[PDB]
Symmetry: D2
Subunit: 454 residues, 4 copies
């Protein structure tokens, strides 16, 4: 035994499963807005010997030894994190140690707020994330709502946009100490300036979760939340096209009233919440971050917008509804209830063809288990050199998939009856197999970032 053996030789069972996923990604139309395809250069850094380095602490302020050059990669990851978002190293710091996006948000709360302090974020069915404080009417399900007292703000159901007026009214009576300005399912750009004015009135910190749109912010193709918010969090595996980690950006220097964000946030990530940093992920983020400073990444993010706008205008002419009218970023929200189908049936219909999407509730729904919409993303296929005409054909396969699920809903009743009919009825099982072949052949022709084997 030496540990240098091959995965294909040491574990052919796992190498087979790990090889069956790559072809599914090659043959599938990934429309999930949160998913991308990480480059090869960042993946071989994520699966490297940096997994074998304990660097608890921070560069210079390490508690153990052996972090000679590991400190240099964390400083490199910090220096290009600010460079990718055009930040002064004297006015903005960055913490690269968050394991993912969810631990990144929890670190901001523990650093700035006391337990049971008041949190305001967009409600989950309206487009907010779990970590922005979410509670059902039955019990608290997000830990942000267990350790802190959260209260959500809703959309304007007429326009589908965030009700900034209702947020101003609600914050004046709830008196939050931190308001989250970030989205998981929202086609337009958040008015971060209006957010800042509401925060300054009730004396609250403005946290901007840049997770879905950070790649567009890095390319400067959409307004940057750094110009109004003073605490920015983001994942690095969505539009950033890197490994699964998290970044926390904070103001630094003087606000002389000093900005006291640098010391508490770094203390919340370690030693409060996390322990050993995933240095293999840090270097993978830094590889993707320097890719974000290149003119290629701006051309990539510019294409993600027009690709989402292309499918958005493509779905409209087919007779589809889009909440908030259309789209200004990377994801479109299709409203399926005007056509007689719901997101639950459509998500299962499109998945059996390898068009991976996700259900999403629409303003006005009262069903939970049967949402009337889907969230379709662009940056996944756009990294595969997809362009406008390619996304127009993606929607053509969507419609022919929706049209299938429409006639199946006429032959079936409950949702449990629906998923059993798509696999039993060979007349529909063959009709689904035809679009599957016609979708997988259209998808394999496009290049795929990363390794060609695994």
């Amino acid at each position: 035994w030496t540990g240098q053996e091959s995965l294909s030789d040491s574990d052919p069972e796992m190498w087979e499963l790990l090889q069956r996923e790559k072809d599914r990604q090659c043959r599938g139309l990934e429309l999930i807005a949160s998913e991308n395809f990480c480059s090869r250069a960042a993946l071989e850094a994520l699966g490297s010997c940096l997994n074998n380095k304990y660097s608890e602490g921070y560069p210079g302020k390490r508690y153990y030894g052996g972090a000679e050059v590991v400190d240099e990669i964390e400083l490199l990851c910090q220096r290009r994190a600010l460079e990718a978002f055009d930040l002064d190293p004297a006015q903005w710091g960055v913490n690269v140690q968050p394991y993912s996006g969810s631990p990144a948000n929890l670190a901001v709360y523990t650093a700035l707020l006391q337990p049971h302090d008041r949190i305001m974020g967009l409600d989950l069915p309206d487009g907010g994330h779990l970590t922005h404080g979410y509670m059902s009417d039955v019990k608290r399900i997000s830990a942000t709502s267990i350790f802190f007292e959260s209260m959500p703000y809703k959309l304007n159901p007429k326009t589908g946009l965030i009700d900034y007026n209702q947020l101003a009214l609600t914050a004046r009576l709830f008196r939050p100490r931190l308001i989250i300005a970030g989205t998981s399912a929202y086609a337009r750009l958040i008015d971060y300036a209006r957010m800042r004015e509401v925060c300054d009135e009730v004396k609250a910190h403005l946290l901007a979760d840049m997770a879905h749109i950070s790649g567009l912010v890095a390319a400067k193709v959409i307004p940057s939340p750094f110009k109004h918010a003073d605490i920015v969090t983001t994942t690095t595996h969505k539009t950033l096209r890197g490994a699964r980690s998290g970044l926390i950006f904070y103001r630094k220097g003087v606000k002389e009233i000093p900005y006291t964000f640098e010391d508490r946030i770094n203390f919340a990530v370690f030693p409060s919440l996390q322990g050993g940093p995933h240095n293999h992920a840090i270097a993978a983020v830094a590889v993707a971050l320097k890719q974000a400073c290149t003119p290629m990444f701006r051309e990539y993010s510019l294409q993600v917008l027009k690709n989402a706008r292309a499918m958005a205008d493509a779905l409209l002419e087919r007779g589809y509804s889009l909440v908030s009218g259309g789209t200004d970023n990377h994801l479109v929200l299709v409203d399926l209830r005007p056509k007689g189908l719901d997101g639950a049936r459509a998500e299962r219909v499109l998945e059996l063809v390898s068009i991976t999407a996700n259900k999403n509730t629409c303003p006005g729904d009262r069903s939970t288990i049967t949402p009337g919409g889907l969230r379709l993303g662009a940056p996944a296929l756009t990294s595969r050199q997809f362009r406008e005409d390619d996304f127009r054909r993606v929607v053509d396969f969507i419609d022919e998939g929706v049209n299938i699920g429409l006639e199946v809903k006429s032959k079936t009743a409950k949702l449990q009856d629906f998923k059993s009919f798509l696999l039993k009825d060979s007349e529909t099982s063959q009709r689904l197999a035809n679009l599957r072949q016609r979708v997988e052949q259209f998808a394999r022709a496009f290049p795929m970032p990363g390794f060609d084997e695994h």
Copy 2:
């Protein structure tokens, strides 16, 4: 740009900086009990395309689609984890989604305890970790102490802990979960004693197997999986996998008067998602499944069986030459010196000679800035096929470093001037480089798991 370019061509920086890490892992003898050198097969799954998949949920119940492959990779890792520790699938279940060891422990707290409820663990300055409930008496450091009221447990004479002063403070603090785990402790823990002492106070037994994880899977050191109810661990230490976490929870059933099932697996799986974290790191789940398959092989048990006799030979070689073991022996994998002359003084002279360790507070130390004890680790170099006479030489290499350090401790002034004249004086850098030379020549000759370049 396609995303398939090599790291050496795309980021010529990050390529060199990582090759300096693998060089350091080969140039030096790593002896931090928590560190290890993972196998090449597992890291290929760590740098996989599974980094791209969003699989929020669990096998069976998932909120997305296109998860056909990752579902079987997760169920494979759960079955490989249950087999690696010889657990009946009907009596035990495992969640394989925690990002690391620290998040795995916080998930068990959120699941079984309400906010500000009471836990008990051995103190960090007494051989514990931050995630067990450590507060600095002037500040609440870890989030284990901010969201849950923890009482630190600590006997300095026996070298062991005070396993009945814990029972003394048990009924007077009345905890709901006591932690039986170690971060810097050389002896075993009476797992039959920790259980009944939790039953008389109506508490839950939590075993944090993070350091002993390998010595338990190989059935060479007694296991907690029939005395404890919930078990958390790292896939990092002694298991030689990627950096992630595991939560071993009981499952199943007897109320003979007037049926009594376990209530664990629905709450801890809800704590991991959607409470604490979001999208699982499938590349980490697949990587640790490779290490778990290796853990069921006799090649891993003989590797484990070597670690104990390597640590025993490590302590005896130090015992035979004027060094006190803070236990009277060690069946674990680490040592505990009483450096009869301090702790923080040895690390600087070691890491400059390409040998890294960490400070350790010995029972009786009145300080924390200049402690008196080093914790050296066997699993790291044992994975490089180190054996008895190979480790006996390692204790002789530290000998010349500690013996030169005792000469610098006789000079200079406080800890600041210790590290000052080392990288400044001309004559002192002679024994620095000579001992580093022979240490590098002795280390590079051993095989190194993982890739050859990165």
Copy 3:
């Protein structure tokens, strides 16, 4: 020494002070809405040997002895508490042990809600009480807002009434577990049915604080909050005209879904919060409670309404503003800003004449230390056999007092300058002395409940 000596003989210093207060109450026009004049029969029961009886527990469920006949007075106090409000002894229980109104509300919260649970009450400047959860924009000042998370609902500034629509909107997003339906400064009757509909939608307990209006509810001259709310609290020293204590009324029996209010509320008062019950106060409340069942008390409460309505219509013809238009209960809220004077100056002007009132903020004020209104009560003087024509003359003295403070504000600037000018300037000091004599001579002619000496 024997302890049977007279207060006039044992302590002539305290007997002098205690005698100077009674004449101030005899000579003064008490317009504070929360104040009344307790009868002699209830006062000599409040200052009796029942002070010398430890009866911790409840009748029958006593922990010590000696409560032979003390148990009978608590059952008598309970039986007439329900009788005074026309409650079925099988559908309503009552706890008479609360020391006062503030401990009564805190007992309801601790019995029904967990720490940091969500509370909704009327904001303090809008007419709510402290114990209904009040927080400034700077810090939490009420213990209800420290142990529980409170959020206030506001008035409709156009109509001066509670904004039930905004409360329905706010409760749907705040998700409270208890909503308070009670007032301290509100001239109209709360729509308790609308309150109940909002509580049943967000699944919250409806607590009605009957403190100011319980005498009107006992006489059945205003709608009873018992017909919609299931938890009712009240003081017994306002319109109840008894000692200073508190009552908690709760549903009992079946809601078979049982009502689980009786056991938890009785446990929160004792042993959770309070200790030894003030049995002298319990019997004093029972004396006043049986007075509330008499036809005299209904004629008294009927007069309190028309006396408040008389002064309300009297103030209107003098050119005064009343928020919410007028009055439907016992207290009128005068808005003084249309006349150029504020409640701070008027309260000090009327106090120096022995017309005791209190400042009160008005909808739209932004001054705190200079409120633009006053809260004038009726049940205090109405118990002195005051009638409509008498209250019309009370307002005549008010106007001539306001007219004084109007011309003083022209000769002065800051509020600290104002209170120093009313005592220095002998030209105004004599003008105030004239209305003082003309007010005290009008007040002494009316009878005064209680002892004629102390």
Copy 4:
């Protein structure tokens, strides 16, 4: 109806039922260490017209008007309280507004501690009270344990507490305030030991003088007012006043390196109002001011000096006839029997003979439903001018009751049949009424403080 009618004419019920209470207080010998017979002068101020005044606020800063008299009555009570315990007004302040002893203690917790912060007091089954932080290990009883995490302190051999096991659990629980008070304990508390043990753990010393309040004012028992920082007490026990509470807090200043004032009096006065309670009970504040004026007289010290030698004669008379004192003596005012034969069995046979006591858990009792110890009290009958030979007779009266109880304990079946055959069997009611007869004839002959009728 005018409100000036006597209680005997208005409520002929309540008149008779109270005269049965004074009859019972005269017919029987009260020996509950907490009970007392208040003076006639204080109760005249308790049944005063000050019950009618709303004086929310403090002398100087009040939110109302017409408080000229009650302001001086409050400042008089503060000065009489500082003098009664010999405190410099510049070094000590007192708040006289707590409704009772339990609210006074909760106010000190809210003022100096944040929610869920940590306190330490002696356990209720070990001689404590609920307000010191008692939880039933299966439920959190007192609100001291619901809003603050309390650890109960407890040595059964010495009879005393374990005054260094408290130090054993001190640094391991790290409280912010330890309580030095007693509800059922016969010895004194080392006040110099409680202070330094709180200083090494950075805690506050709270002395709850509720039972020893009289023995401290008379300067016959050592005082905590130069070792402790905050002191709470009842005006009820040994002080022979109305039922209320007092909060003695330090005030004033020394930072010789690089001025250091006390930070107590602004927070505890804010905790009493407007945090916890609202309107003060001015009739109680005036009543206790009368008892405080009596406490500064030599007639009260010789009364106090009698209580100790009465309790010492009470214990020695019991010691001389086969009874064990749970201390080895008593300098307090209470006893502690080991009833060598139970506790709950004696109270029923006593209160039926017109002598009342209470259960007391002796160190070593495995039960709580049938404890083994009675706590008899001296201050009650000492106030009736009881002396040595008078109390020596009281121990001889209980003798025949306990000796008949040992015969019933030899019969019947469990505690249920003990009290069953007492009020049912014909022959058993003979020694019942005979011993009650001579006990009533012996009790009615002594003078009784307070009024003659009520």
